[PDB]
Design a protein around this ligand. Structure first.
Ligand code: NAD
Ligand code: NAD
Lengths: 345, 345
């Protein structure tokens, strides 16, 4: 277990140290081979090295088995050249590692339904993982352009692009409830027909996992009326972009959300939230997204699924025993991390 | 007021007769010049005329100032040739009239929050109108295609396409709360930049209406966390397709939803619901979507806004006094239409 730890700016060090305290305690009781190195990343590195993804950091990422990122960005570096912003160094980290699948889970922990915008009955039991394709589709498609009379952009997918993001979904689903919904617009678009066609064939090598297909406009409706029926949801880039934000409002707090980017290189695990300058240094930032990102690392980077689930239960009990300020409690980052560790022991 | 009335199949005649009873009563108290003709449309016309949009119907639509459609479709005509289905004659009706804007409102009437999938506090006061562009974008864009190794489809918009759907949104907003949100993906797509650019300029001729711009992935989140802040929302075809279905789950009943398609020809007004064969003839179908479609006709086809709003209030009181079976009450189509008329008098 060689992890590069890039804490970044704002509350990024704060919540990353909390994730590190959980990983270290877990390494004692279980004897992992946790070996980690902390690096300068974005903003903290613009200050030391004059540039957001400095050469030591790049080597460290390249040499580690997984990255545990915190948060980048901040006022201090906002009006800069777009080349050197903390924020573009984040794109450079994913791009350098050829990360093509973004995994973003939305879970309503037991007893936390009151926070969901949805009624308790509908919010109960939601635990959905949206797998979004990151490297293709309309955001990168050519031809694209704009004249004075019109504009065009191309939604394009090749067969290996679809096959590889669908393999991450089938493999993810195996560790979970073995059900994959693939989302497309196949009744109107040939890219949809193609997508459905390819995932269906990928599904044949995973006979233990059920695959269902749904249209995106109908998935937007199911994610609000009955989100608790889904497990893994895999889709294209623009559709994954809309749907993982829609599912992300269902828990009711930005500090509860972990993410992962898997690909050819070193996988990055990170909180959906940013650097939150307004609450930085106040010792109150909710470390749950970071601790659950570290759990996602145990599961997706090191295949340690029962340990990943042990960390999720400990976090689920902690959120009910001493909730952070953003879920209406009073527990600061330290008091809350300690409740988590109490439930690991 | 010359209306062509195409009741169609299933519960279509049932809920259309209810809309007609409201229009007739209203024509007495106010003295409209309501003159309407009932025509054979889809399914009922495949039986009489062997084809879903027969020549008498086509002439009647063409001669009327507005169309009040009911519902088409049904088992009786399901396995047919795709050329002659009831359902394709519906596409032919919109296409023959050059209808390019689809208007679909989602309203949580007072006291009906309990039906919304969202918590009472969030569901309270939702009254949003999604204006969807119907004729362009990726669903019709060229080039499109599919090889064995890949597929492509083109999201393309011309300047008059955007300008004209945005004009319908600005005009609609004037009769409502004067606020338009335009939805795009302008931080990544040139079609988005173009869309935003053109609506902004259209907005200059409507200085009394506020215009705000939002990204689609962020609109999907706002429509669940705080839908009550919006009034009119105008967007492209694929985005309008996803967002008007997302907003349509917020009331909690398919029988509450009216729609309108405005364009160059004769505007069609219709319930979002279909022909519902399972409850047809049982005298229990909820006529609210049809009565509110007739109200939408008063407002958008004949500019009669205070009369359109009078019908909406009467329907709002009726839903609280004698709710249909689908909102948990016991009132059949007739008993419910009578409560509405009691509140018009
Ligand atoms: N370059 C880009 O494209 C880009 C894009 C987005 C953000 N950024 C940068 O990153 C920073 C992001 O800050 P922001 O305010 O936009 O978003 P944010 O997600 O950091 O914060 C939003 C809100 O949620 C709260 N929050 C976030 N995490 C929390 C946690 N763990 N516990 C409790 N509360 C939490 C914050 O306090 C704040 O009230 C900015 O300063 C910006 O410079 C850059
Ligand atoms: N050709 C096409 O592309 C196409 C597409 C969709 C539907 N159709 C046709 O139209 C018909 C649609 O039927 P469906 O079941 O799919 O959808 P539907 O919307 O008619 O019915 C769905 C459910 O909602 C209920 N419902 C609908 N309106 C109601 C109302 N006013 N009051 C109370 N309950 C109501 C129904 O009873 C049913 O339980 C089908 O028979 C089909 O042939 C064709």
């Amino acid at each position: 277990m060689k992890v590069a730890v890039l804490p970044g700016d704002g509350i990024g060090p704060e919540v990353t140290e909390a994730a590190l305290k959980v990983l270290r305690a877990l390494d004692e009781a279980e004897g992992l081979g946790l070996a980690y190195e902390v690096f300068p990343f974005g903003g903290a590195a613009i200050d030391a090295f004059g540039e957001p993804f400095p050469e030591p950091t790049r080597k460290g990422v390249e040499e580690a088995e997984a990255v545990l990122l915190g948060s980048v960005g901040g006022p201090k570096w906002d009006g800069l050249p777009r080349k050197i912003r903390p924020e573009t160094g984040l794109l450079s980290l994913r791009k350098s590692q050829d990360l093509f699948a973004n995994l973003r889970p939305a879970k309503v922990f037991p007893g936390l339904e009151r926070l969901s915008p949805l009624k308790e009955e509908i919010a109960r039991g939601v635990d959905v993982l949206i797998v979004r394709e990151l490297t293709g589709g309309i955001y990168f498609g050519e031809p694209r352009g704009m004249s004075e009379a019109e504009a065009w952009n191309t939604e394009r997918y090749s067969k290996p692009e679809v096959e590889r993001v669908a393999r991450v979904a089938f493999e993810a689903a195996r560790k979970r409830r073995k059900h994959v919904v693939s989302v497309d617009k196949a009744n109107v678009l040939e890219v949809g027909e193609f997508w459905r066609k390819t995932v269906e064939e990928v599904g044949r090598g995973y006979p233990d996992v059920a695959l269902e297909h749904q249209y995106v406009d109908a998935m937007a409706m199911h994610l609000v009326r009955s989100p608790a029926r889904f497990d893994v949801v895999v889709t294209g880039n623009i559709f994954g972009d809309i749907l993982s934000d829609l599912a992300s409002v269902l828990p009711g707090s930005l500090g509860l959300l972990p993410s992962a980017s898997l690909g050819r290189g070193t996988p990055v695990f990170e909180p959906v939230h940013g650097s939150a300058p307004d609450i930085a240094g106040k010792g109150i930032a909710n470390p749950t997204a970071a601790i659950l990102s570290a759990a996602m690392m145990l599961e997706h980077a090191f295949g340690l699924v029962e340990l990943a689930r042990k960390v999720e239960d400990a976090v689920a009990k902690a959120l009910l025993e001493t909730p952070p300020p953003d879920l209406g409690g009073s527990a600061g980052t330290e008091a809350f991390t300690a409740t988590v560790l109490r439930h690991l022991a």
